[PDB]
Design a binder for these strands. Structure first.
Lengths: 61, 86, 46, 91, 77
RNA sequence: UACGGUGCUGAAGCAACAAAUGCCCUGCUUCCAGGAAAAGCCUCUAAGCAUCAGGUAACAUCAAAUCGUACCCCAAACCGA
RNA sequence: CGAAGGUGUGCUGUGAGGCAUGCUGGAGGUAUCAGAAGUGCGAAUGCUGACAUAAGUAACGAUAAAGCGGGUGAAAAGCCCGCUCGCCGGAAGACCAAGGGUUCCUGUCCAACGUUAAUCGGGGCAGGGUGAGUCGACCCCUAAGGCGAGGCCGAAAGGCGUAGUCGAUGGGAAACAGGUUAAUAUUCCUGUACUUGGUGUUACUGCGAAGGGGGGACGGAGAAGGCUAUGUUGGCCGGGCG
RNA sequence: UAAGGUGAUAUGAACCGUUAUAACCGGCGAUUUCCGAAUGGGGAAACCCAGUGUGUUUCGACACACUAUCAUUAACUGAAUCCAUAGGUUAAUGAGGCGAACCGGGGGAACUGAAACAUCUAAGUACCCCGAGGAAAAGAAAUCAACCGAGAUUCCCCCAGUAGCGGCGAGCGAACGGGGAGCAGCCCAGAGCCUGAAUCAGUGUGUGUGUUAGUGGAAGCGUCUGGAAAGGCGCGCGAUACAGGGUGACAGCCCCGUACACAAAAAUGCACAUGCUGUGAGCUCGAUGAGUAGGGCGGGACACGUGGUAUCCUGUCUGAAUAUGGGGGGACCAUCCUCCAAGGCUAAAUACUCCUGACUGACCGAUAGUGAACCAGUACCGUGAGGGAAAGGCGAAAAGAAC
């Protein structure tokens, strides 16, 4: 999953990061409200934010 | 300006209780769990943006942790102007 | 009758608190002793 | 580095089920296996599950020599392959 | 402290011995005095805390070389 | 009406006298034992600034964060096992 | 196909002891000859744990005080509700600070806890509850005091202390009445307010210190007067006619 | 390196992976909240309050960095005061704190023993403080010896409980000399000649060895008792492996291994080989450490308590010769023997264990062994320093008991 992130540019890595954070917020709000049975999305999105800003850190020098 | 990320971080969950309901149907105010370090301003901005509703004022209180292991959390009384939220 | 322990949080922290221990080398040795023994509560500071 | 896997038709060496044959349904991390229909715990009324058994207690079934066998590890085509020891036949 | 800037003499400890040889832990102090020395090269008076043997060393060597020694070991005067 | 309680409507709503240890009063009078401090505050200028900056007034707008707020508290919640 | 251990019984030796095998137990134990001992308990006002005794004895914590009816429950002297009766009333009422820390409120429960029973509880368990520009803290400022750049000292560690910096128990800006929850209210809501900055805009202008001068800013006692909280009585209004 | 996973709890739930990018383990990274040397100022630790820049801004604001003190070095400007200094300011570079023992220093007891006690002993011990390093210290003769000689320190066995010292009491207690372990010596106080001239560290490599993942491993069945075999019994087989641990009782052959053979992207250590970098050789003539040696006084250290007291040290006061010179050779003097102080540096043998891995015990087996086998420095107690527990075991499998 990190590969296709690698060929992506810093500019679009930020857009994806924002998209992931909005998804994290949405999933948090479903999960708190009682729906969202697919409870693993939470871990998936945290992990995806992690790799996105790992890549985004290593691009910056 | 408070940037996008902090807003995405400050709202934890909607607090649901008899008080929270009656608050919604009488004072047109919604009660939320927020990040323990969130501010009146941050909660206000976050609600206005992420919920696309208009807010009059925010009142916050930190609920002390009950013996068990409950962590201290902050409860927010968000008073909407006229938009129906949820 | 009046007993010996009349609590006061301010006085407690000023007399035995963490920064009072750190003020003098003898207090820092109290702290070193208590770490060496592995005290869960290192001082009165709560 | 296992010598007993899931899809594996295996025979029991000890414990009321000597000689019975079955398939390894599950492999528990504690060095026990769930084998098809050997260690049936019958309690009350109706059918119940198979309790675990030590992997030490089952042996891979050669099914050609018709007898239990020991397993070994070699490197055919630069790849760890399991082989029946009493036959040298890759599994 | 009671240290000579020049020689480094300090207070040392020793016994005080009575006629019956009763021993009492005591101290011997350097004969320190704070005295202003004319430094010809610098055209200023430098004040040093020296023992009397310190002044004698100044007299042999001269204040310039002694001040050099103090700078060398970093004593501030 | 859940027998807990809830809603709805609502008349008069004044005067006299007596009043604190409370207020005026940090006053007043007396006394000897002769009764904090600094800031806010108000005014004056100095170096400077100079058709500027500041000040002052009006008026509009906005900001006032963060934390404590339950409960006991002459006591079965504190100090005394 | 029954190890040690435990509990019996028989036999044996001068003893310390040994041997056998019933039962329990359920997995170890060791003839022999050597070797090494944390090698043997009844006492030390021994040490630790168990369990006795007195003995179902004393006691059950202010001599303010209880009695019925109904409810609920398996069960009510103690819980709830009602009616009486007693007790406090400058307190045993209310409100805080300090301290405590969730004891708060609600629903369940009754093991332990509660000197009795408990259906009850500050008990267990689960869910809730603490909303502030004006109240407090923080914050500006200082006292006693603490710490203290340099500094002056002192075998070292350190001591004292100047500029300073902290430190309330003190001085610095401002919200009140009604209504509300099961539990929060000067915080929510309703009405009516007030304070301090910033930012503009307009008018008019001397503005500007770590400095100066005022102010803050002050004792004890006593004696008035003028008041108000507050009460009492009349009137008024609503009800009453025993 | 894998067919299984998502630490335990732990069921579950949601999933993920199956030659390969599930998991897992190693190397190397990135992130790393607040407190705490805590360092931007404060503070009652984990909090409060900033300033200064640089951006952004939706004008409400927001982000990110920096900012402690000291020492040193440089720049700048710079009082009395004229130059000057003192100061100030700004950078850069270090340091700070913690950690078990060991080690070197600066301080320094008492109980006790002497059958009392004061000399003495305990004892330079406990403790305190400061500083370093993987060791530290010491170390290259102003050393012993004895008329022969040896040859730097450290450590061990002797010497020897000897000689001595000692209210000649209690006690304390050497050397010389020998056996060993280990074992290289150097440099400045200075210039010439020579001139990187071998050189000891720094780094970049290259190679060989470790180390931090791992890989393969060799062989057994029938029958009997039993709940189960690993036991018995019969007949085998491997073995450079019959170390161990499991597996339902007691397994060389069932499993994990074991002996043995291997492995490393990468990152490290350790040898060498180099390249280079500060550095210096050799040579010849010099020079040869002064408030010092010694003395007077008061102490301390030497086994040596001042004794007939050598020797060393220094608080105090003095004060040489200087290589035709001086020190020592147990008062002292002569003699003839030996060495060169008043400047340094230095490996090894030696000490120690917070830690890590392996392996072993006529070591313990839950009142034992750590205080603690168990979520223990915990509950608990104290105002605080500090004190300080009790507590293991169902079964082969929860099959943990539906009704």
């Amino acid at each position: 999953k990190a590969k296709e992130l690698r060929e992506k540019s810093v500019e679009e890595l930020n857009t994806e990061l924002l998209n992931l954070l909005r998804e994290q917020f949405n999933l948090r709000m479903q999960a708190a409200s009682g729906q969202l049975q697919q409870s693993h999305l939470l871990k998936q999105v945290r992990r995806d934010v992690a790799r996105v800003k790992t890549l985004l850190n290593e691009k910056a020098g | 300006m408070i940037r996008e990320e902090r807003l995405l971080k400050v709202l934890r969950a909607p607090h649901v209780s008899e008080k929270a309901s009656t608050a919604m149907e009488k004072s047109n105010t919604i009660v939320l769990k927020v990040a323990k370090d969130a501010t009146k301003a941050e909660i206000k901005a976050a609600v206005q943006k992420l919920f696309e509703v208009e807010v009059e004022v925010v009142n916050t209180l930190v609920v002390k942790g009950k013996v068990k292991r409950r962590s201290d959390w902050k409860k927010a009384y968000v008073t909407l102007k006229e938009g129906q939220n949820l | 009758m009046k007993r010996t322990f009349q609590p006061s949080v301010l006085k407690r922290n000023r007399s035995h608190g963490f920064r009072a221990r750190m003020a003098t080398k003898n207090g820092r040795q109290v702290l070193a002793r208590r770490r060496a023994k592995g005290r869960a509560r290192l001082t009165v500071s709560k | 580095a296992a010598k007993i896997r899931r899809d594996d038709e295996v025979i029991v060496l000890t414990g009321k089920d000597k000689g019975k044959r079955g398939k390894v349904k599950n492999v528990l991390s504690s060095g026990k296996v769930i084998v098809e229909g050997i260690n049936l715990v019958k309690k009350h009324g109706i059918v119940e599950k198979e309790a675990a058994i030590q992997v030490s207690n089952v042996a891979i079934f050669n099914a050609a020599t018709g007898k239990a066998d020991r397993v070994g590890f070699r490197f055919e085509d630069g790849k760890k392959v399991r082989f029946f020891k009493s036959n040298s036949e890759t599994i | 402290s009671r240290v000579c800037q020049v020689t480094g003499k300090r207070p040392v400890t020793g016994n005080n011995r009575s006629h019956a040889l009763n021993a009492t832990k005591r101290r011997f102090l350097p004969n320190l005095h704070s005295h202003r020395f004319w430094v010809e090269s610098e055209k200023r008076f430098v004040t040093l805390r020296v023992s009397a043997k310190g002044m004698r060393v100044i007299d042999k060597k001269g204040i310039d070389t002694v001040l050099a020694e103090l700078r060398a070991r970093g004593e501030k005067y």
